[model samples]
Target: MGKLSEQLKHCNGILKELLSKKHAAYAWPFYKPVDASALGLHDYHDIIKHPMDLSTVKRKMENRDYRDAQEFAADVRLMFSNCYKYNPPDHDVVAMARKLQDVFEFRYAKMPD
Candidate 1:
C-alpha cells in the first residue's frame, strides 16, 4: 500500500507539473492536495472534484475489499491518459473534452472491477 501510494503521488506530481505549464485552468482543477473527509466511498463526484488527491484516494483504494491493487493501477493510468487527452495545450477546449470523454469510455470499458 505504501508503495502504491508513493507511485500514485509521483504520477500525480508529474501530471500536475505538465498541466500547470500547458493548461492552467485544467491544471488548477487537479493541483490541490487531497482530503478524504470530502469523499465518500465510490463517490465518483468527489473523485472528480478532488482529482488532485491521488495519494489519499490511493490509500482508500488500497483498503477496498472489492478492488485489487492492479485495478487501482489501471484506474490511475486511465486517469492520466484522460487528462492528457483532454487538456493538451494545442487542442481547443471542445476537442479536448471530446477526446477526454473518449478516454473515459475506453477506461471504463477496460475497468477491472
Candidate 2:
C-alpha cells in the first residue's frame, strides 16, 4: 500500500487520457501518418496517412443501421495496423500506439483475450 497506491493513480490517469478525445468521431491519434516510403505505402499513403474521419464513417454506418461500436473500433485498429505492419517505426509517428493497445484491442477484435 506504500508505492502501489501512487502507482495505481498514475496508471489510471494514463487509461483515462487515451480515450479522452473531445470528439469521439475524431480518430486521429490512432491513425496517424508516417513517411509513406518508410512504411511502403506509397500508392495509398496519401489516404492511409491519417485516421479515417469517424463522423463520415459513422454517417454511412448509421444510414445502413450498421452502428456497431466493436466494428468501428476494430476497423480503426486494422487500418492503422496495416499502415505500419512489417515496419512499424518506433517514433513519434504513431503517437498513442502503445497507450491504448490493449484497451482498444478487445473492442476492435470484438472478442475475449
Q: Pick the candidate with the highest TM-score.
A: 2
Task: Pick the lDDT winner.
Answer: 2
Which segments of model 1 are wrong by more than 4 Å? 1-56, 62-66, 89-113
Residue range 3-105, candidate 2, lDDT tens digits: 4444433333333444367423333544334445775757665445444433433443446433334444555455557545533577553444544455455
Relative to the true structure, candidate 1 reaches a TM of 0.30
Cα error, residue 93 of model 1, in Å, equals 14
- Please give the RMSD to the true structure for each candidate, in Å: 10.2, 11.4
Off-target runs (Cα >4 Å) in candidate 2 are 1-19, 22-27, 30-56, 65-74, 86-88, 106-113
lDDT of 2 at 106: 48
lDDT (C-alpha) at residue 15 in model 1: 35
Whole-model lDDT values for every prediction: 0.44, 0.45
* lDDT at 62, model 1: 47
